[PDB]
Design a protein around this ligand. Structure first.
Ligand code: CLA
Ligand code: CLA
Ligand code: CLA
Ligand code: CLA
Ligand code: CLA
Ligand code: CLA
Ligand code: CLA
Ligand SMILES: CCCCCCCCCCCCCCCCCC(=O)OC[C@H](CO[C@@H]1O[C@H](CO)[C@H](O)[C@H](O)[C@H]1O)OC(=O)CCCCCCCCCCCCCCCCC
Ligand SMILES: CC1=C(/C=C/C(C)=C/C=C/C(C)=C/C=C/C=C(C)/C=C/C=C(C)/C=C/C2=C(C)CCCC2(C)C)C(C)(C)CCC1
Ligand SMILES: CC1=C(C/C=C(\C)CCC[C@H](C)CCC[C@H](C)CCCC(C)C)C(=O)c2ccccc2C1=O
Ligand SMILES: CC1=C(C/C=C(\C)CCC[C@H](C)CCC[C@H](C)CCCC(C)C)C(=O)c2ccccc2C1=O
Lengths: 218, 73, 111, 66, 75, 663, 184
């Protein structure tokens, strides 16, 4: 798809592409706004239509060009044109510098028609109820945005919910020994792979002690 | 080999967010493609707020319940 | 504004407010009370949205379905436009009735 | 082979069944697993077998029923 | 021939009710009270219980159906 | 891109929602911010106390009111307003003397009962409370520094093992610990504070109320009853003994949980785990909800028992103090009651983890399983009460308008009368077994009539409906049939669109917004009941079974002095009351447009106004609107602003009426 | 020791006997036929209506209608004589203690209303059960509707027989419980 050369509306006064329209106060507010949206189309007959900004208009038998402040007005006019069996209309966003961005028929095929090369953006692979609970994701990446969680996080919190209901079989986290641990950070033994072995043996000692203590009055 | 409930067989809806959760509705058709995630199509006598009386459910959301009976949803 | 409140809505409302058991003006006092009730009743429709009432209706419909009482004309709360219309109608009717009683009872007593 | 929705659901079930058992163990360390949180205190199990354990009655755990 | 649904795509149904443990747990250990999992059998065992006699019929005499209320508790 | 005019409202709508802060990353920051805010709030309270004490000391007449309290009137503070007449004399001043305001708070009786005799003592008290405000702010700074020092001590902290990260959860153990807090609150802050106040009474209050006596002997602890005849208040000896008993009981109770040692006391978690609870006690919203639900019975009983059993000297002799205190505390407790439900709903939205679908273990789970039954039965009882109270009131109104007072339906309040008879028999048996009998209990038991029965049914209706709205909002905050994803959204959000039938007022915050109107209405009913029975018990007892009596013999009749305040005949000392009356009517009606008229109309109106501004010669060359773009208030902001206007009008319209009617 | 002054006006029975459990033994109330306020109120009613009557002509129809109204008022005075009214208002009271045997008791109206209200609800429920269609709710099957309306008289027995036999209630797992509160 080739973007056209839509000029800035303040530099294209009196263009032959402009349809005959009455002109109202509803048009884009100059002297305060510099971002304009332009919609172009090619018609077959001078059929009267309604401008999104109040007032009616008559197309041209050839090319047409209109400028609007908002993309919504351009899309409304596009739907109105498409109701009149007028395809091949393109909607551009004009930056303040004059950069032309091609917006509505982005890949050249209207969004209601399946086109190859598209990928489901903002897709979630479950029913809407499958979203994780907001309470589970507190102070994580998804603090108040449980609907933004990746499906792996949703499954992880679901498994956590499943686990944290069998209370008797849970493992209480041992209380840290603050007074005798906690040396200066430079005082470490390195041996990271040995540190997990130390984790294993210390947790084994904790579990054995807990079992021995429980097997006294239980 | 047919998969899912038979056509015209009543099923109880197990989708928690469904308007017809724990209600019953006739099975219109079951899509036989294994790639379809929600193949079971169920129609209901009671329309939801969108005035739609039919919806497609997953294979694990219909339990083949008996007929509703007199004065029973 | 205090003059309007005191010498018009209070002093000149003595006829309508003290109109019980008085032969001609009993209905005007009662209608004054009813107009106040209807005007305040309109505020329930004016201030509230239909989603709360829809959820409450569903909660009640649970109890109805429990006892095999199924209304097949499914109970739905009033549409938003209808809620506004009902609120406006009750508001204007109640206020008009309040003024109506207030002016008519006083002029009937004085004459 | 292509990953049907049934196969994805099977992976969901396998993952959940494994992880729900793994997180109960001594290798997950969640704040909800602290003392005073959901899990029982280390040497003082309160409810086992759906019966009040002897540790419920505190210092009376050593007392005889008679 | 209807294919059997695999356990992966099976259903939970609603056999798990408020009177019993859920997916996997144990109920609260209440002291002497209603304990254990209830099952509907009142009326059936009421038709085997003795006490009915010829003064009122000869079968299990219970107008008002006070026996059956246990069986209804589930409904 | 930047913001619009709605930024101010958006920010101020969550200005204290510390959970919604952007820099806050952990419970440590949240808890420390909350603790510091608590310190600042305590400083504000202390400064307010010192303020009242100062103004009583400086711009007031405590030294003269204490001498002749029954006919005298206290002074709140002077009036310095340049808008008054620089000539003549205002109705609030004795000619050339300064302008004053009569205090309707009740601090004069409080200080008189507590043992104040001189202005100098009040001045020293003001100084001490300002000192305490300084101390509170310095404690805030101290604790901020101590927690930052722990954080810095994590620069010299490592467990030499991968379990070192466990220390993340214990950094705010100072604030989040529950057993120590419960033990020390219930013991020290309650029991020993009561015991210290008993000491204060025995050392000052009882010595500075009667002739000199023995060295504060244990005869200062009496068990008389109520309403000492001369001062028409509770015996100070009885009050000291009551505080002593409460202190001893709470001191004993405060040794329950395991606070400082692991070898003494039971843990709260183990207490809950073996009961019908085991809730998520780490939620701050849950704790806030259940302590607001605790301050509510306390404040409601404060309102009831300040009036029924007046504890302060000559408090019953003030016709305005007794009504103002009751109405104030009733409104405070209504606000706290609705707060408890609002924060329960916020707890369910934000800080509650639920099982998969069927594990009926949590109490909230069991409540949610049959929430429809709860709401349906609450709706049924609300409908019954409303139907049968309004219909009987309508019967009485119609049959009394038709010259037939004897055709009314007057259900004699037999159950309340039986309770009163039992309590009166108990009290009379207590009194008859005394060598110092002939005691009085003031309004502990009051004449109960059919009007009382109907008003109590109306109050029960209001409470039922308020609880209905709040409970429905809490239970369906996480999802209803209409919107089965409500826990994915915020606690307060605009709507769910016009489709699916229309979804205005769907959030749990909208349920709170609807319930606040019913809270205000129920409180208005309670306050009207109390004030009407206070003004004329006889006329209330006879003519209060028909609503026209409430409309005429109370509202229309008792509003005479207030409207006459300022007129074209002169002004009274009720001029401020009448002016505030009209201003609060204007505020109440002004919030109707924020509630009735909704956003889109106004957004179009604002677009038109902005068109004008961008079209006016000089404005367009200075202000294009790109910086702080004016926009209409959002939907939730609009509902909240209308609610604020309505609440302010309804609440603040009443005190002028109370002052005009009683004074 | 004068409980009236001790409790600020209200008086207490001070006696524990079963004979005082009736409403008729209350010291607040008094039979209407010997109460001063009752006499004064109905005398004022008679006086006002009579004063209105004299304003009209003697032979007019309004005079006869006012005579009929006066007769109605006097009949009301003599009919409420056995009804209990307070010793200070004179307005007769309604008894809501379940007495069943006093003038103005609420037991008889309660029983009558409960019967007819259960009748209405049972007729509606029967019609809804026998017409399981929306078309039958907008276009009422009048013969079936009146059949159910007549059949509703036996509701206190049929409803209980359905309650105990499992034909009124439905298990919660067959109707929509409500909105989901969890899933993750
Ligand atoms: C008493 C309540 C009340 C009040 C005061 C207003 C006020 C207003 N409404 Mg409104 N409205 C209300 C109720 C009310 N409404 C209700 C119940 C509804 C039903 C939905 C509406 C529906 C409605 C619509 C649909 C429209 C309005 C409009 C207006 C505005 C036009 C009038 C105007 O500009 O005067 C000025 C405003 C005043 C309040 C006059 C008094 C001003 C004070 C006395 C003087 C200044 C005070 C001084 C500066 C003190 C400073 C403040 C202090 C902090 C220092 C105005 C802001 C219209 C509008 O905005 O168009 C322009 C409009 O379109 N209203
Ligand atoms: C709980 C207290 C309470 C409440 C809530 C109400 C509620 C109501 N009363 Mg009311 N009333 C009460 C107590 C109360 N009454 C008592 C105790 C009395 C003494 C008997 C009265 C006497 C009374 C009378 C005599 C009247 C009402 C009216 C009304 C209705 C006004 C509705 C409306 O839209 O007004 C909108 C308000 C206005 C349009 C303004 C009218 C009031 C002000 C003072 C007029 C001043 C005009 C002035 C030139 C400035 C106007 C500004 C302009 C821009 C609008 C409403 C039903 C009135 C009614 O039916 O409608 C007006 C009416 O006629 N009441
Ligand atoms: C009224 C309810 C109640 C109940 C059921 C219990 C029950 C219990 N308490 Mg307890 N306690 C209570 C009130 C109660 N207490 C009060 C009011 C206080 C404050 C004085 C305490 C102070 C207290 C302490 C200090 C300790 C207990 C302990 C215990 C446990 C051992 C019982 C024992 O040896 O006591 C005979 C037991 C579970 C002990 C325990 O097991 O703690 C681990 C323990 O150390 N309690
Ligand atoms: C144009 C209207 C107007 C204005 C601007 C003021 C301004 C003021 N009045 Mg005021 N007053 C007015 C009309 C007005 N009055 C009328 C009509 C009456 C009835 C006769 C009164 C009766 C009155 C009393 C009785 C008192 C004042 C006081 C005050 C001062 C309090 C300021 C303050 O603490 O802010 C604080 C503002 C807020 C907390 C509001 C936040 C929102 C202030 C100078 C007080 C005073 O003298 O203070 C020293 C005081 O006690 N006024
Ligand atoms: C005069 C004003 C008025 C009146 C009469 C009502 C009446 C009612 N409201 Mg309502 N409401 C009002 C104003 C009013 N509201 C306002 C201003 C708001 C703020 C938005 C609300 C918000 C509100 C909520 C949020 C709820 C109610 C509910 C109710 C019902 C309570 C049950 C009852 O008593 O039914 C008896 C019926 C009547 C007394 C009406 C008369 C019927 C004929 C005439 C007899 C009832 C229909 C609750 C409800 O639905 O309960 C089931 C409920 O959930 N109301
Ligand atoms: C939803 C129903 C409901 C509710 C919430 C209340 C609430 C209240 N009533 Mg009350 N009352 C009701 C129905 C209700 N009433 C009915 C139907 C009657 C009979 C006419 C009464 C008669 C009554 C009297 C005489 C007194 C109260 C009082 C009170 C207050 C104190 C609580 C108390 O003792 O009540 C008692 C508890 C109940 C009444 C609960 C019963 C609920 C059932 C379901 C209502 C229906 C019963 C049914 C009609 C019986 C039919 C019998 C028939 C088969 C023969 C409280 C505000 C007292 C009061 O306010 O004094 C200041 C008081 O003295 N009530
Ligand atoms: C077949 C008719 C019928 C039956 C059996 C019931 C039965 C019930 N309703 Mg109900 N209801 C009905 C119609 C009916 N309703 C209608 C038409 C409405 C719309 C106004 C409601 C609105 C309603 C609410 C808002 C609530 C109930 C509640 C309840 C339950 C408690 C009893 C109660 O509050 O009654 C009181 C009933 C009313 C106040 C509604 C008015 C009664 C209508 C007018 C009767 C209509 C009958 C119908 C015309 C019969 C025609 C028969 C003919 C065709 C042959 C109970 C299960 C409550 C609940 O769930 O608590 C458990 C509750 O909060 N109902
Ligand atoms: C007498 C006075 C009593 C009357 C006061 C009663 C008011 C009730 C208190 C309720 C306050 C809590 C509700 C609240 O803050 O949120 C009410 C809403 C909450 O705000 C909503 O929050 C949601 C997230 O939870 C979403 O972000 C919504 O977009 C946002 O609007 O707040 C606002 O909308 C405030 C707008 C108006 C702000 C005015 C600033 C006040 C400055 C003067 C001081
Ligand atoms: C709200 C807030 C807060 C606060 C509060 C407060 C606390 C306040 C205060 C206020 C205040 C508290 C104020 C004050 C003021 C004061 C002043 C203003 C003073 C002045 C003085 C002076 C100036 C002095 C002088 C002198 C000297 C120097 C010495 C000698 C003497 C003389 C006098 C000469 C907080 C923190 C919570 C936070 C948030 C916000
Ligand atoms: C209360 C309320 C409802 C619920 C109210 C409903 C559904 C009204 C319908 C109830 C019946 C059908 C009305 C029939 C008339 C009454 C039963 C009796 C009126 C006459 C009596 C005096 C006899 C809404 O649906 C609603 C929607 C949008 C905004 C606000 C609201 C709103 O405030
Ligand atoms: C009146 C009204 C408005 C208009 C009110 C607006 C746009 C805001 C009015 C603000 C007033 C005029 C004060 C403006 C503030 C001052 C300029 C001071 C500025 C303070 C900041 C610098 C913080 C709405 O936008 C609206 C939206 C939705 C439902 C109902 C309504 C509604 O009723």
């Amino acid at each position: 798809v080739v973007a056209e050369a839509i000029p800035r509306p303040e530099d294209l006064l009196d263009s032959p592409k402009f349809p005959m329209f009455e002109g109202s106060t509803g048009g884009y507010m100059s002297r305060s706004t510099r971002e304009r949206h332009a919609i172009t189309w090619t018609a077959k007959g001078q059929a009267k239509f309604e401008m999104p900004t109040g007032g009616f208009a008559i197309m041209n038998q050839g090319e047409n060009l209109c400028y609007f402040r908002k993309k919504e007005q351009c899309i409304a006019l596009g739907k109105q044109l498409r109701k009149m069996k007028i395809e091949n209309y393109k909607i551009y966003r004009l930056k303040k510098d004059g950069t032309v961005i091609f917006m509505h028929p982005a890949d050249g095929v209207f969004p209601e028609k399946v086109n190859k090369g598209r990928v489901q953006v903002n897709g979630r692979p479950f029913t809407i109820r499958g979203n994780p609970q907001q309470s589970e994701l507190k102070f994580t990446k998804y603090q108040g945005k449980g609907y933004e969680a990746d499906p792996l996080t949703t499954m992880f919190v679901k498994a956590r919910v499943m686990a944290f209901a069998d209370v008797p079989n849970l493992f209480a986290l041992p209380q840290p020994n603050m007074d005798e641990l906690v040396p200066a950070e430079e005082v470490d033994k390195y041996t990271r792979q040995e540190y997990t072995t130390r984790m294993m043996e210390a947790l084994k000692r904790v579990q054995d002690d807990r079992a021995a203590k429980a097997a006294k009055s239980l | 080999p047919w998969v899912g409930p038979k056509k015209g067989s009543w099923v109880k809806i197990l989708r928690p967010e469904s308007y017809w959760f724990q209600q019953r509705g006739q099975v219109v058709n079951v899509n036989q493609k294994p790639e379809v995630k929600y193949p079971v199509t169920v129609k209901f006598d009671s329309v939801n707020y969108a005035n739609v009386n039919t919806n497609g459910y997953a294979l694990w959301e219909v339990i083949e319940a008996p007929a509703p009976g007199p004065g029973e949803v | 504004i205090n003059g309007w409140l005191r010498n018009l809505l209070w002093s000149e409302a003595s006829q309508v407010i003290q109109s019980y058991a008085l032969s001609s003006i009993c209905p005007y006092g009662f209608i004054f009370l009813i107009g106040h009730f209807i005007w305040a009743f309109s505020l329930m429709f004016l201030f509230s949205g239909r989603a709360y009432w829809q959820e409450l209706i569903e909660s009640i419909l649970w109890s109805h379905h429990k006892l095999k009482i199924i209304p097949h004309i499914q109970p739905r709360a009033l549409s938003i436009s209808q809620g506004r219309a009902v609120g406006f109608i009750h508001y204007t009717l109640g206020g008009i009735g309040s003024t109506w009683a207030f002016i008519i009872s006083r002029l009937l007593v004085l004459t | 082979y292509t990953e049907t929705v049934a196969d994805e659901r099977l992976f969901e079930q396998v993952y959940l069944q494994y992880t729900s058992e793994y997180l109960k163990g001594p290798l997950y360390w969640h704040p909800d697993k602290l003392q005073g949180w959901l899990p029982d205190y280390p040497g003082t199990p309160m409810i086992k077998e759906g019966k009040y354990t002897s540790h419920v009655i505190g210092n009376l755990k050593a007392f005889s029923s008679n | 021939x209807x294919x059997x649904x695999x356990x992966x795509x099976x259903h939970p149904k609603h056999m798990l009710v408020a009177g019993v443990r859920g997916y996997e747990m144990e109920w609260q250990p209440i002291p002497g009270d209603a304990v254990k999992y209830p099952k509907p059998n009142s009326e059936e065992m009421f038709k085997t219980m003795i006490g009915a006699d010829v003064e009122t019929g000869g079968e299990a005499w219970d107008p008002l159906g006070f026996h059956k209320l246990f069986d209804r508790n589930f409904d | 891109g930047r913001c619009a005019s709605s930024r101010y409202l958006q920010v101020l709508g969550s200005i204290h929602d510390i959970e919604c802060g952007f820099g806050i990353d952990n419970t440590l920051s949240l808890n420390l911010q909350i603790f510091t805010a608590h310190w600042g709030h305590l400083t504000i309270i202390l400064i307010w106390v010192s303020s009242n004490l100062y103004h009583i000391a400086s711009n007031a007449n405590y030294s003269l009111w204490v001498k002749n309290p029954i006919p005298s009137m206290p002074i709140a503070h002077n009036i310095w307003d340049p808008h008054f007449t620089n000539s003549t004399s205002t109705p609030y001043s004795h000619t050339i003397i300064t302008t004053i305001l009569i205090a309707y708070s009740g601090i004069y009786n409080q200080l008189y009962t507590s043992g104040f005799n001189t202005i100098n003592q009040i001045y020293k008290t003001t100084f001490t409370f300002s000192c305490l405000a300084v101390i509170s702010i310095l404690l805030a700074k101290i604790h901020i520094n101590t927690h930052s020092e722990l954080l810095h001590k994590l620069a010299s902290h490592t467990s030499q093992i991968p379990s070192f990260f466990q220390l993340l959860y214990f950094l705010d153990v100072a604030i989040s610990s529950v057993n120590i807090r419960f033990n020390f609150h219930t013991g020290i802050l309650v029991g020993l504070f009561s015991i210290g106040y008993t000491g204060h009474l025995l050392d000052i209050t009882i010595p500075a109320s009667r002739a000199p006596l023995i060295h504060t002997s244990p005869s200062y602890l009496t068990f008389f009853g109520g309403l000492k005849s001369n001062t028409s208040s509770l015996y100070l000896t009885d009050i000291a003994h009551h505080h002593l008993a409460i202190g001893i009981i709470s001191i004993l109770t405060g040794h329950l949980y395991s606070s400082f040692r692991a070898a003494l006391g039971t843990y709260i978690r183990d207490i809950l785990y073996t009961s019908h609870l085991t809730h998520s006690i780490k939620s701050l919203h849950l704790a806030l909800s259940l302590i607001l639900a605790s301050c509510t019975p306390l404040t409601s009983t404060t309102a009831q028992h300040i009036y029924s059993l007046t504890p302060y000297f000559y408090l019953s002799y003030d016709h305005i103090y007794s009504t103002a205190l009751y109405v104030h505390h009733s409104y405070i407790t209504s606000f706290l009651a609705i707060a408890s439900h609002a924060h329960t709903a916020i707890t369910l939205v934000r800080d509650w983890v639920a099982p998969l679908e069927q594990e009926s273990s949590s109490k909230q789970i069991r409540i949610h399983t049959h929430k429809a039954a709860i709401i349906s039965h609450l709706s049924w009882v609300s409908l019954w009460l409303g139907f049968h109270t309004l219909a009987v009131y309508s019967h009485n109104d119609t049959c009394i308008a038709f010259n037939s007072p004897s055709k009314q339906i007057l259900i004699e309040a037999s159950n309340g009368q039986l309770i009163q008879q039992a309590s009166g028999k108990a009290l009379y048996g207590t009194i008859n077994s005394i060598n110092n009998y002939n005691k009085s209990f003031d309004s502990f038991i009051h004449p109960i009539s059919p009007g009382d029965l109907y008003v109590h049914h109306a109050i029960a209706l209001g409470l039922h409906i308020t609880v209905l709205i709040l409970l429905k909002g809490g239970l369906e905050a996480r999802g209803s049939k209409l919107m089965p994803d409500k826990m994915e959204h915020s606690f307060g959000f605009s709507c769910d669109g016009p489709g699916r039938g229309g979804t205005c007022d769907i959030s749990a915050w909208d349920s709170f917004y609807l319930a606040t109107f019913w809270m205000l209405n129920s409180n208005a009913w309670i306050s009207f009941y109390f004030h009407y029975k206070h003004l004329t018990p006889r006329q209330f007892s006879e003519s209060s079974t028909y609503l026209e009596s409430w409309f005429r013999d109370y509202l229309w009749f008792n509003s005479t002095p207030l409207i006459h305040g300022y007129s074209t005949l002169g002004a009274n000392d009720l001029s401020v009351q009448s002016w505030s009356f009209l201003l609060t009517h204007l505020a109440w009606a002004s919030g109707f447009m924020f509630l009735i008229s909704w956003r889109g109309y106004w957004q179009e109106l604002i677009d038109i106004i902005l068109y004008i501004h961008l079209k006016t010669p000089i404005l367009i060359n200075l202000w294009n609107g790109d910086i702080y773009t004016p926009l209409a208030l959002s939907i939730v902001q609009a509902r909240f602003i209308g609610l604020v206007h309505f609440s302010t009008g309804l609440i603040l319209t009443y005190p002028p009426f109370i002052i005009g009617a009683t004074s | 020791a004068k409980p009236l002054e001790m409790f600020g006006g209200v008086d207490i029975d001070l006696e524990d006997t079963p004979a005082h459990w009736t409403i008729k033994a209350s010291p607040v109330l008094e039979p209407c036929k010997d109460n001063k306020k009752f006499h004064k109120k109905l005398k004022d009613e008679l006086y006002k209506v009579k004063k209105n009557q004299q304003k009209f002509a003697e032979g007019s129809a309004a005079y006869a209608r006012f005579n009929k109204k006066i007769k109605m008022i006097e009949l009301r005075e003599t009919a409420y004589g056995d009804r209990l009214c307070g010793k200070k208002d004179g307005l007769p009271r309604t008894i809501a203690t379940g007495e069943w045997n006093v003038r103005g008791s609420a037991m008889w109206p309660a029983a009558i209303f409960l019967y007819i209200a259960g009748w209405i609800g049972w007729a509606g429920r029967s019609y809804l059960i026998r017409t399981n269609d929306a078309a039958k709710e907008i276009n009422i099957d009048v013969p079936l509707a009146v059949t159910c309306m007549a059949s509703g008289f036996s509701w206190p027995v049929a409803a209980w027989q359905e309650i105990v036999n499992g034909e009124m209630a439905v298990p919660n797992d067959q109707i929509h419980n409500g909105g989901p509160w969890n899933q993750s």
